[PDB]
Design a protein around this ligand. Structure first.
Ligand code: SF4
Ligand code: SF4
Ligand code: SF4
Ligand code: FES
Ligand SMILES: [K+]
Ligand SMILES: [Zn+2]
Lengths: 181, 112, 240, 157, 218, 124
């Protein structure tokens, strides 16, 4: 956790000998670092004088010579097509059901019905004349309940912590720290 | 459409009086065999009879006083371009693209 | 009081060949696609008089309404408990001169309630006014002030509409496609007049249009179908 | 063991009775060099108009010569198999199909032999060879590949 | 006369005897090609226009296969896209790394089709090296860098048939096939320089225009 | 003179002098491009009226330097491979064909490669 750390465990220059004892006797919080980085540790091999020979990293499926056809991993051309649902298609889905839950006849009798919603069908009329169970089953939810706005993050929850856990300002300060839960 | 919409655009008067725009569809390039840049209609302005480009004396740049030299508009229907040109009150002229004439091509024709 | 480790010298993990799964990034939005589709339809059913159409892309739901349907749909999405979009984040536009109404005014609403975002699209022409949402959302005062400055859209009902970005007495609305990127004029300090004066534009190096060398081949295909299997009209099966 | 000379019975086991030039060998020979010689034959005899066989038959030839000396990598054994599939079905005349089948024949039935050849060369040379044959120190100096085993196996001539 | 066919679900009505690629180009489906030009005789050697026909195992050169009636033509099967990347991986096996110094840089069909239809990685690290050819001198107007030729015969078909200059042809066999004039002689036609536009790659470029501009500037 | 100082030549005529400020480069008199502006005309300008022409940048002309290199000669192979003698810090690897009886320069580096068997005729 983020508990206080002894000063000699931080990479900054610190006093030694008699001055260390003076520094601990006079400072308010003896484990506060001066902030001057250790000359012998900080950036000691400069970025231009390293020893690591860099190698280009390549994950196997997308960098392999084999089993690596580009059309498998060509996601830029598998983008979701843009589909706009007008009132007419909503009516057609509402009256005829969906592809998963068909409510359309078969053969030429069905092909008659689909062609009905192949041209303009205002949705105001469709709701006026249809089974009230359809709205409770298709349009609304859970037996007539409304459709709440969907959440971008179903795992977004919060909970209240206390200073013994979040380490920040005590209870008197006018802010509260929220965890995940 | 019918309104003199240019009176609200704040554009300088010279685009109405002194410049000529062109409505055209870009032609297919001889070098490459692609046929995609020739499917959208574009509007470009004619160059100026003087002061379109002149050599900067110091560094040899290409100075210009034409503020429409790097302005090309894009459309997807020919009518939208003409309607938009009409709305602004532009003195345009349309360049009808050429249409390639169909000729059937057969592998066997090399001997027959 | 042990001496500090030299983090340069401490051992590092060894890896052989790395493996990372390849899968379509658009798949992980699948659950979000259905729920926006349901909630998009819900708004249309509640207000068939206004919602022309609705569209879903990944995790973004758009509602397309007329200019005369703006205040109604905005109010519904603000006050309805199922969709409490109290916060309006963005008001903007876009210029498509090919269409009869070039300007396309877009609103983004945020629901801190249910952790959702919705988008309203409403068109406009150069002279046709659009209702102002300032009476509903006070945060649109400056977003509408900016759209007029850069698109010239008439906003009906705005308490104080004026230039916010461009100079005072600036002629023309910059983000319209017909407005050249370098504008029409430029300023300099004139010795005779003892003041900074405007002069017509004259570039020492004319802008170079490298955009002509664009691709002559179509670069991205027709796309892929990701509609939920509960929002497609069923195919009438053949008879015996 | 039960091979019966037919236009199709030999086809079931992947081969065929094309010109009935039945060849019988013994275990005291290296089939890698024998198949390599067929690859250098179809290359030298391909007319050279279709792209897959004008170039791909050179792709096979440039790789079997590294196979016959074992200067390759173990995964490159199945790399050349993917090459042979890129040739078949794309050419005008059946010479392209006839240049890829012998490559599959070596891989299909004599796979461990190619691996042993590569494992020999690792021990024989002492330093493992990367993709394409490049040793750790192989580079280009004043216009020639240096510090690397160059396979002058293109008939020299 | 016209035969009604569908290409990827798009109904096509063309004159009978036409090739598949013209039918596809009328339906809007784009079929990549190098060796097919709409003013030249049909050769079927570049093998890039391959499609799949419903009643066949064998891929069809859509630039050569004449159209049928009721035929179903596929162009976007995973089988086809595998073929397009295979062919692309073959043309670039011997192609030089010349794009920076190549006058065809921003307008080369071997670049745009490879970008669109080929893979994004190359699998050729061979130690023997690529094929090298000597540049042939055929006059003061055509600058030849024959390392870059993809052996598509547009130059040969144009000069023989359209231009009427039979001194240009393919000399050699297989991996040593060398477009040119065999002996050293200049190409003599008033229309000889149109070959510069037909050559899809930097093999034949303008000599007066050499090294002076890139196509995105103009 | 102003005859060599204003026209480009493949090779100069007189020996270049480093102190002559009118030369195109300190190691070359005449320009090396048809469209390169001569240095004599470039500095005959008002902006140079009160300058010190000896301190203006005068990099050594690269055309004269590159022809001071020897020709690489390849042994029993007609194809040279060049990569800029730096690998990942050079130019892309390009293969040069040496069938013709001449020294073919590299497209990027400008190094000239030939065959050993052709050296005697080339060195004539
Ligand atoms: S497949 Fe046949 S026709 Fe095509 S290049 Fe090879 S040998 Fe010639
Ligand atoms: S022809 Fe095209 S692919 Fe080949 S070097 Fe030139 S630009 Fe590159
Ligand atoms: S030189 Fe050009 S036009 Fe002629 S075959 Fe080669 S790529 Fe085609
Ligand atoms: S375009 Fe058909 S094979 Fe070349
Ligand atoms: K060319
Ligand atoms: Zn070089």
């Amino acid at each position: 956790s983020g508990g206080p750390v002894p000063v000699f465990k931080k990479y900054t220059t610190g006093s030694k000998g008699i001055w260390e004892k003076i520094r601990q006797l006079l400072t308010l919080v003896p484990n506060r670092s001066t902030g001057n980085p250790l000359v012998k540790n900080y950036r000691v091999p400069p970025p231009g004088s390293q020893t690591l020979k860099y190698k280009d990293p390549v994950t196997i499926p997308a960098g392999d010579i084999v089993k690596n056809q580009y059309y498998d991993r060509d996601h830029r051309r598998n983008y979701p097509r843009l589909v706009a649902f007008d009132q007419t298609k909503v009516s057609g889905l509402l009256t005829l059901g969906s592809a998963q839950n068909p409510r359309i006849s078969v053969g030429e009798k069905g092909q008659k019905e689909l062609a009905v919603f192949d041209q303009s069908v205002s949705l105001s009329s469709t709701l006026a004349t249809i089974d009230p169970k359809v709205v409770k089953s298709e349009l609304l939810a859970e037996g007539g309940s409304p459709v709440v706005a969907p959440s971008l993050n179903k795992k977004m929850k919060f909970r209240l912590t206390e200073e013994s856990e979040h380490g920040m300002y005590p209870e008197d300060y006018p802010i509260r720290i929220f965890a995940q839960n | 459409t019918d309104l003199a919409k240019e009176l609200v655009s704040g554009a300088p008067k010279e685009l109405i009086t002194e410049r000529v725009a062109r409505i055209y569809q870009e032609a297919k390039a001889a070098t490459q065999s692609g046929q995609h840049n020739t499917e959208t209609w574009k509007i470009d302005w004619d160059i100026l009879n003087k002061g379109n480009r002149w050599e900067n004396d110091l560094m040899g740049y290409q100075s210009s006083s034409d503020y429409m030299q790097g302005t090309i508009l894009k459309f997807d229907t020919r009518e939208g371009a003409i309607r938009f040109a009409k709305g602004q009150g532009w003195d345009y002229y349309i360049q009808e693209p050429k249409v390639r004439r169909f000729v059937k091509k057969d592998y066997s024709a090399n001997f027959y | 009081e042990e001496p500090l480790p030299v983090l340069r010298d401490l051992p590092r993990p060894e890896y052989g060949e790395l493996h990372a799964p390849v899968y379509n990034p658009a798949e992980k939005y699948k659950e979000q696609i259905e729920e926006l589709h349901k909630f998009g339809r819900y708004i249309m059913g509640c207000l068939p008089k206004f919602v022309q159409q609705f569209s879903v892309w990944k995790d973004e739901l758009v509602i397309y309404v007329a200019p005369s349907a703006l205040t109604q749909v905005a109010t519904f999405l603000k006050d309805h408990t199922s969709a409490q979009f109290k916060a309006c984040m963005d008001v903007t536009a876009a210029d498509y001169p090919t269409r009869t109404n070039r300007f396309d005014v877009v609103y983004n609403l945020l629901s801190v309630r249910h952790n959702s975002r919705i988008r309203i699209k409403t068109y406009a022409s150069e002279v046709s006014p659009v209702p102002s949402v300032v009476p509903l959302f006070q945060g649109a005062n400056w977003f509408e002030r900016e759209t007029y400055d850069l698109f010239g859209i008439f906003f009906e009902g705005h308490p104080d509409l004026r230039r916010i970005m461009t100079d005072y007495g600036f002629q023309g609305h910059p983000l319209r496609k017909d407005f050249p990127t370098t504008g029409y004029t430029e300023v300099r300090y004139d010795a005779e007049k003892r003041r900074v004066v405007y002069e017509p534009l004259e570039l020492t190096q004319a802008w170079r249009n490298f955009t002509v060398g664009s691709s002559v081949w179509e670069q991205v295909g027709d796309g892929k179908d990701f509609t939920p299997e509960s929002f497609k009209l069923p195919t009438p099966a053949p008879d015996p | 063991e039960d091979v019966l000379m037919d236009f199709d019975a030999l086809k079931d086991v992947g081969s065929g009775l094309g010109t009935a030039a039945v060849i019988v060998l013994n275990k005291q020979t290296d089939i890698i060099r024998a198949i390599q010689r067929f690859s250098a034959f179809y290359k030298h005899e391909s007319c050279g108009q279709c792209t897959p066989c004008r170039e791909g038959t050179t792709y096979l030839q440039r790789m079997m010569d590294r196979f016959v000396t074992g200067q390759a990598k173990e995964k490159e054994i199945d790399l050349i198999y993917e090459l042979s599939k890129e040739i078949e079905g794309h050419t005008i005349c059946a010479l392209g199909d006839a240049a890829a089948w012998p490559v599959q024949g070596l891989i299909k039935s004599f796979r461990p032999e190619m691996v042993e050849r590569i494992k020999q060369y690792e021990a024989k040379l002492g330093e493992s060879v990367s993709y394409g044959g490049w040793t750790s120190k192989g580079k280009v100096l004043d216009g020639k590949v240096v510090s690397n085993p160059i396979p002058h196996d293109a008939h020299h001539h | 006369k016209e035969v009604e066919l569908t290409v990827d679900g798009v109904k096509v009505s063309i004159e009978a005897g036409s090739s598949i690629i013209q039918a596809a180009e009328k339906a809007g489906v784009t079929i990549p090609r190098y060796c097919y030009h709409e003013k030249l005789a049909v050769a079927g050697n570049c093998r890039m226009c391959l499609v799949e026909i419903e009643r066949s195992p064998k891929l069809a050169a859509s630039c050569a296969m004449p159209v049928q009636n009721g035929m179903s033509v596929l162009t976007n099967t995973p089988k086809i896209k595998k073929a397009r990347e295979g062919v692309t991986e073959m043309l670039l096996e011997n192609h030089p790394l010349d794009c920076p110094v190549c006058d065809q840089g921003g307008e080369c069909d071997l670049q745009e089709q490879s970008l669109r239809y080929g893979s994004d990685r190359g699998r050729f690290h061979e130690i023997v090296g690529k094929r090298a050819v000597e540049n042939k001198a055929i006059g003061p107007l055509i600058k030849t860098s024959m390392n870059r030729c993809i052996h598509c015969t547009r130059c040969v078909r144009f000069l023989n048939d359209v231009a009427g200059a039979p001194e240009f042809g393919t000399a050699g066999r297989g991996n040593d096939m060398q477009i040119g004039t065999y002996v050293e002689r200049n190409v003599n036609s008033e229309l000889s320089a149109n070959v510069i536009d037909l050559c899809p790659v930097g093999a034949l470029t303008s000599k007066p225009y050499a090294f002076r501009a890139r196509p995105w500037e103009l | 003179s102003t005859k060599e100082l204003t026209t480009a030549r493949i090779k100069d005529i007189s020996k270049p002098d480093e102190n002559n400020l009118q030369q195109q480069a300190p190691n070359r008199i005449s320009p090396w491009s048809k469209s390169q502006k001569p240095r004599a005309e470039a500095q005959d300008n008002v902006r140079f009226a009160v300058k010190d022409l000896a301190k203006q940048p005068r990099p050594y002309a690269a055309i004269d330097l590159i022809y001071k290199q020897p020709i690489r000669y390849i042994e029993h192979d007609n194809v040279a491979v060049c990569d800029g003698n730096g690998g990942a810090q050079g130019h892309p690897k390009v293969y040069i064909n040496l069938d013709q009886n001449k020294a073919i320069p590299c497209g990027y580096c400008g190094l000239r490669f030939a065959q050993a068997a052709f050296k005697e005729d080339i060195e004539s």
